[PDB]
């Protein structure tokens, strides 16, 4: 039962993450790249600095990773292999974290209430800052879920150990990349 609770959370939280990145892209990013609203000169064409590579992270999770986790729904003890398979894609969290301080300062110093206006307009509970921390959260959270699986799966579970090793290494590499 515990292994299934965890896989169920893994999947439910993955869907939410995909939903949240999607929201972020289609509200905050879209308004800027639209040219429907008037954009502060401080941030103009600096969407690459604000959102870093989050499009690419979304595409990964939305085209591939969620489809593949789903396939492991009845295979919790093997789901570490999913991460092994797709390890290279997680390197894009390294790029993302690197950029995050730059994104954050940029927003303080030069966007005033641009994003607050959009938040308010669309009626979102999450600020642009709340959406933009999520990839950092998510990348450190996977390793928690795998540890939980390790507490309740048998010695048919180096199909977790290697998954976990990957998901310990990604955030560390991201961590060690920061200026």
């Amino acid at each position: 039962r515990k292994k299934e609770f965890i896989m169920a959370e893994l999947l439910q939280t993955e869907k939410a993450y995909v939903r949240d990145l999607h929201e972020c892209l289609e509200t905050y990013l879209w308004e800027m790249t639209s040219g429907v609203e008037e954009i502060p000169p401080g941030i103009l064409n600096k969407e690459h600095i604000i959102f870093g590579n989050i499009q690419e992270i979304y595409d990964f999770h939305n085209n591939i990773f969620l489809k593949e986790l789903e396939k492991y729904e009845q295979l919790p003890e093997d789901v570490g292999h999913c991460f092994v398979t797709w390890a290279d894609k997680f390197q894009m969290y390294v790029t993302y974290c690197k950029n995050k301080p730059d994104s954050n300062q940029l927003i303080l110093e030069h966007a005033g209430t641009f994003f607050d206006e959009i938040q308010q307009r669309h009626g979102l509970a999450n600020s642009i800052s709340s959406y933009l921390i999520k990839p950092v959260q998510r990348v450190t959270k996977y390793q928690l879920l795998l540890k939980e699986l390790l507490t309740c799966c048998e010695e048919g579970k180096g199909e977790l150990k290697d998954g976990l090793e990957v998901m310990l290494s990604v955030p560390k590499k991201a961590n060690d990349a920061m200026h």
Partner: protein, 177 residues
């Protein structure tokens, strides 16, 4: 309407996720303790005046010294937590949590929260502790830690019994108005 970002930091042993889940759902999750608490906001009324309170978890990031501070900027209040039945977590307030929080957010108020109050009177826990030549963390210890770090309050709570829980977050808000 006033929006409040509140970040919750501390060791894995505090039960950060559990605390937040228990506060927000009004119930200890019991069956299964989820590992994920997604950034939350909700309107509550404090001293009459309604407020939008924002809660960010930090669990998972405890080994990532340069990633954790990504969540720090523009925080209105921090909860620095330790578990009342982990002396290590308590000492970490001083050694790890307070320093990085001050280094990045020098003027942001801190509430010191001792969690797992329900285990401080628990034989099996107390015995597990006696075996390591240790005891639970008592009330004057928390007060003295709070003074040392500049906490506006030291508060104790249980996610399990809900005791002191609502108060923790009420006081997080009162420290910003």
């Amino acid at each position: 309407m006033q929006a409040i970002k509140c970040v919750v930091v501390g060791d894995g042993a505090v039960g950060k996720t559990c605390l937040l889940i228990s506060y927000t759902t009004n119930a200890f999750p019991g069956e299964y303790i989820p590992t994920v608490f997604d950034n939350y906001s909700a309107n509550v009324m404090v001293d009459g005046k309604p407020v939008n309170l924002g809660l960010w978890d930090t669990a998972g990031q405890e080994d990532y010294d340069r990633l954790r501070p990504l969540s720090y900027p523009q925080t209105d209040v921090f909860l620095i937590c330790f578990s009342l039945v982990s002396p290590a977590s308590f000492e970490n307030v001083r050694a790890k949590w307070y320093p990085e929080v001050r280094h990045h957010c020098p003027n942001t108020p801190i509430i010191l929260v001792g969690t797992k109050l329900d285990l401080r009177d628990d034989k099996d826990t107390i015995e597990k502790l006696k075996e390591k030549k240790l005891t639970p963390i008592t009330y004057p210890q928390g007060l003295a830690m709070a003074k040392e770090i500049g906490a506006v309050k030291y508060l104790e709570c249980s996610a399990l019994t809900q005791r002191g829980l609502k108060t923790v977050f009420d006081e997080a808000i009162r420290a910003v108005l």
